[PDB]
Amino acid sequence: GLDFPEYDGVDRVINVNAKNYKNVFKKYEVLALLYHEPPEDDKASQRQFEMEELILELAAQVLEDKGVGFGLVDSEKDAAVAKKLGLTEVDSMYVFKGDEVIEYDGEFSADTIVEFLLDVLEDPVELIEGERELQAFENIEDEIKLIGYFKSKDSEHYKAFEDAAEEFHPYIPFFATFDSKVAKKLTLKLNEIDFYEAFMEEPVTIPDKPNSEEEIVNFVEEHRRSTLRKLKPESMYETWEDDMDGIHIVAFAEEADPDGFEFLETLKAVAQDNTENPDLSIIWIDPDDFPLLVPYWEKTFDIDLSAPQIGVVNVTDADSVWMEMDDEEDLPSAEELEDWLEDVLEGEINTE
């Protein structure tokens, strides 16, 4: 009569210090460090911190046999170590895997953190061989993808590709093929790399092949914001930050619902009608992925998340505006979405 993991009370979160830290690092394949400021002296702050500790404790327990360690770094009592390690942002989590350091910018909960760490544990490059797997690859599009064709894993150009892959791990999946048939189908010349924007079927080729790590890294950085991007728990705050002006276009759509899916197809049509519009950026949030936030969103934005929604959220002014859609009617077309967004973003309203 199976159950489901619950914290067993055993503390597995290391108290880090100048004496132990080097050994802490040598012990684990992946090490997650909580860099936090001590809680306020009041019992409400003490409480709050202890209940928050349950998250990483559960994660540490679950991942114990997978070579993952968790450690705590006090911003004051461990300031020396924090400096040496490069821990600069108070109250956050840094993840170390070999030579890579990753600032966690995801949802702070046990399941999402464990999912993130399992992703960090995976290898940075996935190999595609054969037409069946190629066809599957072509069906995955809710994420940026890079795919390159190289001679073999010993190729210097493959190694540069893998270096760049580690740099963006595990946020941006990298794929390689050593299979000339797959390459032919993808139209990849040897050492050529194709970049697929999220929700786009046609790739862009990284110019000036063969590509150095520098060329790949610069290209990915310049192209990191897809016109349409899915908000994901594991990286939600990184997605939300990484906006120049504090103004966001947000679309709510439940992929598992016909209306939601219909809206999603419309958002994709908008994106594909704006392939030369480097300013347009829409964040798609599927409410099914964030059930604990749904009532908060509904209350804050005054919308019903049983239905698709699109709006403009201005963080600076702490306000927003949402497109009115009548339930008795079909959803707006891509053109009508485009028109409404333009009207809002150029500036409007005034009533009586």
Residues that bind Ca ion (CB under 5 A): 15, 17, 74, 78, 101, 109, 111, 127, 187, 208, 227, 243, 245, 247, 257, 259, 304, 306, 330-331, 338-339, 343
Q: Least CB distance from residue 75 to Ca ion, whole Å?
A: 10
Handedness of CA 62, 16, 29, 105 (dihedral sign): positive
The amino acid present at 116, given as its one-letter code, is F
Q: What share of the chain is helix, strand, coil (3-state, %, to 5)?
A: 40, 20, 40
Smallest distance from Ca ion to CB 244, Å:
6
Shortest Cβ distance from residue 131 to Ca ion (Å)? Answer: 13
Instruction: Give which of 222, 227, 343, 341 is closest to 284, Cα–Cα.
Output: 227
Q: Which of 127, 104, 100 is nearest to 115 (CA)?
A: 104
Residues 87, 47 contacting (CB under 8 angstroms)? no
- Of 44 and 239, nearer to Ca ion (C-beta) is 239
Closest approach, Cβ 119 to Ca ion, in A, equals 14
Q: Taking the complex as a whole, how short is the minimal distance between the CB of residue 340 and Ca ion, in angstroms?
A: 9
Residue placing its CB nearer to Ca ion in the complex, 1 or 6: 6
Alpha-carbon span 131 to 137, nearest angstrom: 10
In terms of CB distance, is 68 or 229 closer to Ca ion? 229
Taking the least distance from each CB to Ca ion, the nearer of 68 and 115 is 115
Nearer to Ca ion, 1 or 263 (CB): 263
Distance separating alpha carbons of residues 62 and 10, to the nearest angstrom: 12
CB of 209 to Ca ion, least distance (A): 6
Q: How far apart are CA 30 and CA 17, in angstroms?
A: 18
In the complex, least distance from residue 9 CB atom to Ca ion, rounded to whole angstroms: 21
As given in the structure block, the two tokens for residue 233 are 């728990």
Sign of the C-alpha dihedral, residues 150, 151, 153, 154? negative
Beta carbon nearer to Ca ion, 29 or 339: 339
Pick the closer one to Ca ion by CB: 52 or 257. 257
C-beta closer to Ca ion: residue 109 or 218? 109
| Least distance from Ca ion to the Cβ atom of residue 204, Å | 9
Q: How far is 332 from 334, CA to CA, in rounded Å?
A: 7
150: Cβ contacts below 8 Å, ≥ 6 apart: 157, 158, 161, 176, 177, 178, 190, 191
Q: Which is nearer to Ca ion, 54 or 127 (CB)?
A: 127
For residue 268, give every residue at least 6 positions away whose Cβ sits within 8 Å of its Cβ, in sequence order, or none.
199, 228
CB 205 within 8 A of CB 194: yes
Strand partners of residue 321: 312
Shortest reach from residue 27's CB to Ca ion, in Å = 16
